[PDB]
Design a protein around this ligand. Structure first.
Ligand code: 5YH
Length: 490
């Protein structure tokens, strides 16, 4: 008997490698794809324009793909626990499918939905295609606790099956054939909203730096895996000035929203390795494996993104310093390297991993001694590839709050920028107020003589702030403080 299925998009915003959507379609007489938009989400949230644009463009891409099959995405407004009982009744739903969510809050949401579906006679299929592995299997093999060091994680997955291959494509014919009739007034209720409807400024015609959606994700995957990009990205990567700019082959926002399947990426990367080198090392997959590591650590920890009550996080007496945090968040620290990175993050929504090391170091154990929790919140607002697991996980790792086995140094907020871009043009691009400084002073403009500041038409302390701390004194004190925190544990 043919099901009436609803496939629920949350992440996994794609039609390729979507085993949950396969389960919705197989043996269905009727299928509807829904995204549930909580109309009061923003009331509790301060998420910025770049993440909203990326989400909306991802939903518009799904709707465009569904229109090719004479169907539509249903953007249902409400909270899942409220709308699903109505949808079940009104649409006569017999099956609900969705990609598994490992994050503690989503797991609790989904468990409640599964209870309500069971009560209503609705079958539920979930598939764990957001990650490479069954995270619960990793934890099970580790004595029912997540690994807390990366080598242990690698040992565990090294005695597990390989990640599942990407699922086969849903039949275009099957999907158009089993579609729900779209009403002409679909957009009364179920349309994808425009950015201007969310109060954001009017969008231009030019493309975003990071255009959302599955179509863009797959085009980027293709370019990313061109042989001509193999040396630059996998054989001999270099952290140079050009690396700091958003790359047209970058995949991380698409992986985070599920516009790109991590299993597809994994096996296409393996395929390219085979062609070029004629069994790859684990390091080939490091980007995906570190992501999986943080997902595994997060899934059973509802306090993962907090310090207090987080069982894996050392309790550190961070300063309560809202003025410093606000300066850090707005790029007003007076360190042009830090400020340019935070400006790029706010303007575009992606910054290089080593630039994330730099600004997170400055906020937490390197300089300002503000809790990593506040850095998590700012990255959640602004960073396209941040989610509960990788954001908090990376901040705890970087700040030596969790996963600690050895100390590693924070980069210098002057020297690291100077080395990465000796030209200073990264600074000039994101902090044009500083553009007249010669490259000798542009990373440390408080050291420029008054003659140079006058000719650069930027007087430090007036047109651009003085550095908010003395880095040499502050970082040595902070190192001393952290060392004592850890050595005292004995
Ligand atoms: O470089 C290394 N070594 C081990 C892992 N890794 C890559 C990091 O995960 C990159 N990264 C993030 C990715 C997503 C996100 F939402 C937040 C962060 C983030 C926060 C930090 F404070 C510092 C690094 C950060």
């Amino acid at each position: 008997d043919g099901a009436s299925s609803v496939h629920w998009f949350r992440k996994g915003l794609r039609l390729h490698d979507n085993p949950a959507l396969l389960a919705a379609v197989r043996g269905a007489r009727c299928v509807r794809c829904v995204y549930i938009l909580d109309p009061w989400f923003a009331a509790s949230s301060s998420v910025g324009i770049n993440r909203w644009r990326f989400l909306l463009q991802s939903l518009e891409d799904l709707d465009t793909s569904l229109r090719k099959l004479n169907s539509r995405l249903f953007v249902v407004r409400g909270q899942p626990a409220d709308v699903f009982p109505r949808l079940f009744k009104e649409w006569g739903v017999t099956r609900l499918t969705f990609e598994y969510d490992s994050e503690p809050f989503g797991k609790e949401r989904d468990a409640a939905i599964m209870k309500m579906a069971k009560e209503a006679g609705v079958e539920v299929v979930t598939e764990n295609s957001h990650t490479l592995y069954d995270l619960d299997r990793i934890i099970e093999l580790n004595g029912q606790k997540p690994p807390l060091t990366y080598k242990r994680f690698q040992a565990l997955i090294s005695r597990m099956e390989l990640p599942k291959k990407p699922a086969v494509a849903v039949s275009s014919q099957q999907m158009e054939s089993c579609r729900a009739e779209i009403q002409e007034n679909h957009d009364d209720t179920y349309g994808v909203p425009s950015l201007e409807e969310l109060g954001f400024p009017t969008e231009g015609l030019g493309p975003a730096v990071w255009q959302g959606g599955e179509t863009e994700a797959l085009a980027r995957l293709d370019k990313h895996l061109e042989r001509k990009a193999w040396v630059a990205n996998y054989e001999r990567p270099r952290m140079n000035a050009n690396s700091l700019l958003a790359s047209p082959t970058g995949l991380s926002p698409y992986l985070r929203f599920g516009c790109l399947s991590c299993r597809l990426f994994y096996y296409r990367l393996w395929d390219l390795y085979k062609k070029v080198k004629r069994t790859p090392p684990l390091s080939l997959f490091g980007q995906l494996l570190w992501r999986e590591f943080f997902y595994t650590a997060a899934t059973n920890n509802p306090r993962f993104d907090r310090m207090e009550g987080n069982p894996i996080c050392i309790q550190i007496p961070w300063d309560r310093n809202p003025e410093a945090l606000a300066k850090w968040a707005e790029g007003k620290t007076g360190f042009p390297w830090i400020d340019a990175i935070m400006t790029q993050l706010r303007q575009e929504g992606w910054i290089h991993h080593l630039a994330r090391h730099a600004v997170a170091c400055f906020l937490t154990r390197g300089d300002l001694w503000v809790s990593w929790e506040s850095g998590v919140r700012v990255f959640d607002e602004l960073l396209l590839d941040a989610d509960f697991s990788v954001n908090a996980g990376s901040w705890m790792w970087l700040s030596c709050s969790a996963f600690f086995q050895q100390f590693f140094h924070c980069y210098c907020p002057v020297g690291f920028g100077r080395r990465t871009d000796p030209s200073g043009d990264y600074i000039r691009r994101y902090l044009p107020k500083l553009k007249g400084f010669p490259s000798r002073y542009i990373y440390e403009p408080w050291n420029a003589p008054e003659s140079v500041q006058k000719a650069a038409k930027c007087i430090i302390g007036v047109d651009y702030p003085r550095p908010i701390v003395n880095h040499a004194e502050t970082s040595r004190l902070n190192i001393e403080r952290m060392k004592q925190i850890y050595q005292q544990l004995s």
